[PDB]
Each structure stands twice: as C-alpha cells, then as structure tokens.
Amino acid sequence: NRTVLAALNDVLRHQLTAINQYFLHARMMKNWGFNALGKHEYKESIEEMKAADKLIERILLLEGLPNLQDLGKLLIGENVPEMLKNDFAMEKDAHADLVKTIALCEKQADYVSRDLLSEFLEECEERMDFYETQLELVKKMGEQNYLQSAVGAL
Amino acid sequence: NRTVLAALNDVLRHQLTAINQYFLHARMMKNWGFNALGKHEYKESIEEMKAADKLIERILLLEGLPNLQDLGKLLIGENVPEMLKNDFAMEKDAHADLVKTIALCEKQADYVSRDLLSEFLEECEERMDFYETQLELVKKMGEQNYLQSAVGAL
Amino acid sequence: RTVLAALNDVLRHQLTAINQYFLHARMMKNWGFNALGKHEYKESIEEMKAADKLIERILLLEGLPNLQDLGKLLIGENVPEMLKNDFAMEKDAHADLVKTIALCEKQADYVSRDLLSEFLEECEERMDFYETQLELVKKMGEQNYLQSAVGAL
Amino acid sequence: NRTVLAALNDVLRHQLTAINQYFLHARMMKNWGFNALGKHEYKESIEEMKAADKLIERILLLEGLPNLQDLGKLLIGENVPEMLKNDFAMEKDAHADLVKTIALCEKQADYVSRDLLSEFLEECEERMDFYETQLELVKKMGEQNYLQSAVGAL
Amino acid sequence: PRGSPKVISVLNGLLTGELTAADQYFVHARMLENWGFKVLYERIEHERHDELDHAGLLINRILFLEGVPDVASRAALNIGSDVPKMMANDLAYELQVVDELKAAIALCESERDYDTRRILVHLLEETEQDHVRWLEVQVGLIDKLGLKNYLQSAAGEI
Amino acid sequence: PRGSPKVISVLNGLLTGELTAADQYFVHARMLENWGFKVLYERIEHERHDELDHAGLLINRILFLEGVPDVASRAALNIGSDVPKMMANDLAYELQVVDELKAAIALCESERDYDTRRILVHLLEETEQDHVRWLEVQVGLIDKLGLKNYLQSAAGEI
Amino acid sequence: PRGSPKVISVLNGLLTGELTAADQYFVHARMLENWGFKVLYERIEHERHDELDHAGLLINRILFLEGVPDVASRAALNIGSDVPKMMANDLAYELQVVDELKAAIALCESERDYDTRRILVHLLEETEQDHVRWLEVQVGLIDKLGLKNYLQSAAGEI
C-alpha cells in the first residue's frame, strides 16, 4: 500500500536518526570515560540498527523503496544529562508517530507490518522507561553520583 | 587544526554514505534471493560501520564534533551489476578523497590520523579490487552464471 | 460460530497447502531436484505444524474441525509451473487469512487472532520466497535455476 | 500397468483418509486430556503419513500421477470407545483393499510395489491387533479404568 | 509515559482479579496437598506462581503508565469443599477473568495503547490455553473417569 | 489432630499478617524496579518470596489443625512514597509481626501445641534475623551513607 | 646498518624522555598504592610497564642503528602531591613526549629512515591513544565526578 509504505519510510527515517544519535552519544560517552553508560548506549544503538534492518526488509517485502537518505535532526548534548534528555525526547516524539503508524497499519489490514511495528513499539517503550529512569536517578542520587556510576570501573 | 578535522569529517560522511549504500544493497540483494552476494555485502557494510566507529573515535579525540547528520547521495542499483558499478564508483571517489586526506594529515604532522586513514585506504582498495574483479567476473562467466553464483545454495 | 467457520476454512486451505507442498516436494525429488525438494518438504512440514496448531485452536473453541474438505490442488508439470502454483495458492491464503484476522478482531476474539497473525507472517514469508524464486528463474535462466535446485548430484 | 497404478492410488487415498482421521482423533484425545492415548494416536498418524510418503514415491517412480486430492469419509467418534471402533473399522476397509491390491500386483508381476504393500499390510494388521485389543481391554477393565489409563499422568 | 485513566482503571481491576486468583489458587493447592493429592498440588502450585507472575506484569505496566497499582482490594473468594468444587470454582473464576481481559484488550486497542494490548493478549493467551483449558480438561476427566479414578490419579504415589 | 480455636485463630491472624506483608513487599519491589533501584528490588523480591513461603507454612499448619485458613482478609497497607519511607514502613510492619509472633508463641506454649510453637519460632527467627535485621541495617545506612550515596548503592550497575 | 647522527640524537632524546616517564610513573604508582588508590595504582603500574617496553624498543632501534644509547641521562621529574596534580603532571609530560615524538617522526621521514619512522609512529599511537587519552579522561572525570567521588573510584574495593 502507498500510505503504509510512506508511513514505514517515515518510521525508518526515525530509526536511522536514532541509530546515528545513539552511536554518537555512545562515542562521546566513551571519550569522556563513561564506560558503563557508553556500553549501554552502544547496545541500544545496535538494537536500533537491528530494528531498522527489520524495517528495511519489511519495506522491501512491500515492494517499496526504503529511504536511507533522509535523516532527522540530531539532538546531541554537551553533557550526560543533556544526552539522556535528548535521547528520551526523540524516543517519545517518535513513539507517538509509531503509535499512529500502528493505527494506520491496522486500518489497512496490514497485520505483519502491524506485528513488526508493535515489537518496535515495545522496544521503544522499554527505552523510554530506561531513559526516564536515568533522568530520575540523576535527580535522586545527584549528578556526581550518577556520573560515577556511569564511569563504572575506573 | 580545523583543516584536519574538516578532512576527517568529510571522510566520515563518506563512511556513513558507504554504510547506508552497502546496507541497502545487501537488503535488496537478499530481497531478490542473492544470498551469497547479499551476505558479502552485509559483511562489507558491517566493516564500514567498524571503520566509521574508529573515525568517530579519532575525531572526538582531536577535540572535534563528528557530523553524523550530513550524508552523501546514495547510488541505489536497479540490479546486481548496477549495484556493483555503483559501489565500485563510490569506492573510487572515496579512495581519491582518502588519499587527499592522508596527504593533508602528513602535511599537518598528524601521524596517528595518517595511520588510521592508511588502514582505511587498505580496506577501501581491497573493496575496490573486489568490485572490479566482480564486474570482470560478470563479464567473463556471463550474467546468468554470475547470478547463479550470487544466489549460492538454494 | 462465524469465527469457527472462518477457522475451518483456513484449516481447509492449510490442508490443501499441505497436500500440494508434499506432492510437489515428492515430484521434485522424483525429478532429482534435491535442494528444491528438500525446501518444499520443509514447507509442507511447517504447514503440517500450522494445521496442528489450528486444529488445537478449533478444538479449544469446542468446534468440529472439517478435515474432510480439501481445496483444489494446483499441480504443476515442470518446476516453474509448480513454483507459480505455490505462489498463487499462497496469495489466496493471504487474502483469506487477512479476512479471517479482521473477523477475529471484530468478534473480540484475540487468541485465535494472534495465531492467525503468526500464520499470516509465515504465509507472507512463503509468498516472498516463491515470488523471489520465480524472479530468480527469470534472472538466471531456467537451466541455471534447475542446476541450483538439483544441488549436489 | 494402469490397474496397478489405480490400485496404488486407491491405497493412497485410504492412507490419506487414515492420516486425517488419526490426527483428528489424536487432537481431540489431547483436547479431552487423554495424553497417552493421544500420543499413541499421534504416532499412528505419523506412521501412516510415512507410509503415504512411501506410496507417493512408488506411484511417482512408476511414472504415475498420485491422487492426493481424494479423501474417504472420515469416521469421527464422539467418545474414546467410538474413536477406537471407528479406527478399527477404517483399518478393516483398508486391510481388505490392501489384500486385493497385493493380489493384483502379484498377478501383474510387479514385485517392488507388492513388497511395499506387504510392509503396509504388516503395519495395518498390527494396527488391527492393537485396536481390537484396546476395545477388548475397554470391555474387560471398564470404560472408567480404560479412560484413566488413557490419561496416564494427570 | 502517562496513560489514559481508563486503561489504568481497567488494569487495576485486572490486577485485583489476578491477586484474588492467586489467593484462591494458594488455598486450593494447600488443601489438595493436605488431602494427599500431590499431582494436583504441584499443578496448582505452578498455576499460582503463574498468577503471581501475571500480577507482577500488571503492576509493572500500571507503574510504567504513572498509575497507582491498587493491591489491597480483593474480590470475594470461592473456596471449594472438595476437588470437583475446586475445579468448578477455579474454572468459573478464570472464565470471568477471561471476559474482563477481553474487555480490557478491546478498550486498550480503542485508546491506541498497543503495548498494554500486547501484555493483555499475552495474559489472555496464558489464561485460556493453560489455565482455562486445564480446568476444562479436569472437569471433563472427573466426568468421564469418575470421581474415584480421578482422585486416584490425582493422589499419584501414596 | 484437633487444633484449638485459639491456636487456629492466632495462626489465622499471623497468616493475614504474612499475606499483607507479601502484598506490601510486592508493591515496594515493583516500584523499586520502576525507579531503577535494582539491588533493593532484587532483595525485596526475595523477601516477598520468603513471605509467601511463610504464608504457605502457616496455611499448612492451619489445615493440619483442621481449621479453615483466613486468606481473604488483609491488613491496611502502608506504601512509601520514596525509599526511606518505604523501608521505615517495612521495618514497622516487621516489628508488628514480631510482636504478634511472640504473642502467638507464648499462647502455643501455654496450650501444649509444641509443633505449632516450633513452626512459629522458626518464623520468628527468620523474621528477626533476616527481615528485621536487614531493614534496620538499611535505615542505618540511609542515615550514615546519606540518601544520595545510599541510592547510588541501591541503583547498582546501570 | 649505520644510521644518521640526527636520527641517533632524536632517538636518544626520545629514550631519555621515555626513561624519565617510566621513573615518574613508577613513583606515581607507588604513591598511589601508598594512599590506597588500588585501581589507579594498577593502571599506573601497567602504564609504567608499557613505558619500559617502549624504552626497550627505542634501545633496540638505537643499537640496530649502530649508535650508543644514553640511558644515564634523566630529565627533571614532576611529582604530584595529590592525585589531581599527579594526573596533570603525567598528562603534561606525555604531551611533551607527543610533541618530541612528532618532531622525531618528521626528522626520520626527512632522513629516509622508514623503519625508525614506523617504530616512532607505533610509539606515538601508544602515547596518544593509551596514555594521553586516559589521563585526559581522568582529569575530565575529576572535574565531573568531583574529587571525592573520583578518589572513591580510585580506591576501589577495600
């Protein structure tokens, strides 16, 4: 379907943007020595890459052309709290779009795409839970304690 | 200096474009049932991601901000020989830019960057030789035999 | 009762798919196409497991599975014909399954719905495999495709 | 020979009907909780499908067209004693058909298919003995005791 | 991730139902162990652990959606005097839980909250294929085998 | 073996206490997992499973004494807004159950129910040396480490 | 094979720098161990071992070039009175070593000593990616975590 393919292309554009932002954030975290947070950000990046792989295979299933050219605005922070808040922000703003896309897929009687997007939604919502938890942990234990935990093993 | 960071960012944009192009080509190759060629292309895409990882490391170490937003034009092929030609051409252009970057790094007494870019050049010319000989293999053994080899085990 | 009737129709198609896939695999092994015959044997086995799951689901709903009926078998005389016959049967499968899933969602019945949704996932995967096989036949030539389908001599 | 191929197709139709009946009976035995009887019926089904595989390969090797389209009347029992009785009756019909077909194949000096049908007849006679014994056990030990034995582990 | 108040309310209702199911299953398993029916006791210990896991999933979902998981609330219990009454009460309660789960799945689909819909579909599948199916099987087995044979099978090794 | 109404009544009260503690520990562990305090979450989940085992022991003892367990009744829950209040409430409930168990043990001794007394003494030993001890240690650590450092240790590896 | 006098002189300067760095890292590691900063002590010990390895490589190159190493020569030592000063002094010395290494690599390239250039490029990579990078990370973490938190991380388990 044309509308379903366009919506999947928009979701894929989100996925590529998230991959780039996650990997950049992980790289500057490693640069600053936050090994634990860098490792987790790298893992979330890789998971986003696998999800984008699934989406591209799904788009090619629907005889469409995946769009790997468009990328959304990259929210890169100057410090760890800004990275966490930017990542959570993009996850939420794209979670709304993913929900709308799942509704559209249900409308068009596209149920394999709906299943794939529901799995993507479950992973995305776990990510928002993790990032909201990280922001609240920064609020609770303090900035310095959270940074010390992010460093992990010196 | 700003010139070395600009050159490294240009090489990084080349790397990201190569990553996206290789992944798209692998996705369509396995969409068409070219399992062996698709696997090789996916592996090359993974190697390009590892190279872009190293490049982001080096750019961050040099007190710079990697540009993961900007991307080059994707030469998406309509069939396997067109994918081979597009990949070979973009590898040739990237190799020329890489040689210019290596020369600039040597000029600026940036030797660790020169070592990293020399590794990149070695891998890039390996890829360039591979795609050149694959095009010559398409010529030598014919299109249908090459497609049969590219599919591999049914 | 409508959900039961739809499930029985899906089961009838799945039984027909079992028979067609198995007969095609046996013909491919008779002709010597070992790789294609093995793949079609695996596809028939997966459809047997799917029919097993659907019979479990129908019996759980206190219905009577209709294993007597069987759809028409599209039997091909050469490998490309059996490929396209499998593809056409899978297309009919997909249309019927989508209608069934919409019906199951409408009737507030959700477990048979996720069963039908996974069934639709495998069905679409098989549809892609057969369309790709036909395009590959066209791409490499029938002689090369048959050489690949033979596998080891 | 045409008559041998027709007899083989008839035996194949009998076997496919037996496959469907046995698998359905196993499934409703498992639905009612008769795990052990359900497992035995499932195994009997699987053996009948292996027999149908052998028969289909034989029909093809005789340069004939297997008729997997036809199916006989499924006798479906309302309870376990009726299931066993229906299975025994269907085996009765199948055994008579098998004996006639073996005689015909012997007459036409087609001995490989005769040997395959002899194997089929041995298994069919074993199935006769099993179901007759099960019905006799029902009569001897009581329906309630037989159903408890069919349940096995609760 | 603030969710709709209706979704939170129905999830709290499902949580109350699930906790009441856990309590009923606990009591029934304990009295089956007391009577010496160790096979049934093992099956219902497994089932009670499953219901505790379901209640945990529901509580996690309600806490994710910035809702307060009500757990003090309990529904009226139906403790069976003998094994057939155990089976009947458990089956009836699980069927009512299935009805509530189907209503909640429909509502969650309506409010476009699809992750909760996936969680509730998982819960409904577990309730139907594992709990409701086993209790229906047990009722049918008590009918067919007779009470004495069924209780002998439930006792197992004496 | 007949159990006296007083012993069965105090056992039912103890069972109600254990069930209410299990629910409170359930909610507390789930909100601790929600807040990212993984170490505290695992500890509280283990303590809740311990409370479930205690309730099972109590139900088995009550059913031995030919008495119907009181599983439906629940005491008032005290859910803490944050970790310090969480664990102050946990310690308060544990001390309440400690006093209840001591009274029950004294009554069991006064009534020649020596096996019930043994089971209750095992329960009191577990409560005092595992649940109460850890909770008082946690309050002391909140005072000494400070709230930020204690929450850092509670969060563990992120 | 005979080497250039300029190549030998810059190699001797690099060797003097590397020996001084090894001695400074030795004292720093031992004063960190004395202060109980176990993980910092282990890291600085490993860095000192790497410095001895690099000095050995330089001496092998110098002898291969038929020169005489200057191991008696030692540069001034900048020893820090506390961990931040120790990290800053180590970073400054490694930066000076980086500049000297770059000058020596340029000289080797001009003098057509490509094997020596390869050795010095490997040394520069080790100094930039292992030593300078880690020290800059440490100063950044001192400023981000704070001195107290950084010293707690440096102490490790006690």
Ligand code: HEM
């Ligand atoms: C744009 C910059 C990207 C970077 C820097 C990057 C980086 C990486 C790295 C370092 C790995 C691990 C390689 C290894 O462990 O050997 C990886 C794996 C992978 N990447 Fe990328 N990636 C990028 C983009 C993408 C995109 C756009 C996709 C798909 C659309 C993708 C798909 C994958 C997949 C499927 C894997 C395999 C993961 C697994 O199977 O464990 N990557 N990536």
Ligand code: HEM
């Ligand atoms: C009509 C409904 C049928 C159902 C529900 C069904 C179901 C099954 C199941 C559940 C299996 C188990 C596979 C596994 O666990 O690995 C199986 C295997 C098999 N089926 Fe079917 N089947 C059906 C029809 C047929 C027919 C008509 C044939 C052949 C003419 C056939 C041939 C086979 C064979 C050869 C196997 C493999 C046996 C083995 O691996 O031991 N089936 N089937």
Ligand SMILES: [Fe+3]
């Ligand atoms: Fe060929």
Ligand SMILES: [Fe+3]
């Ligand atoms: Fe008996």
Ligand SMILES: [Fe+3]
């Ligand atoms: Fe449940």
Ligand SMILES: [Fe+3]
């Ligand atoms: Fe307790």
Ligand SMILES: [Fe+3]
């Ligand atoms: Fe060095």
Ligand SMILES: [Fe+3]
């Ligand atoms: Fe601290």
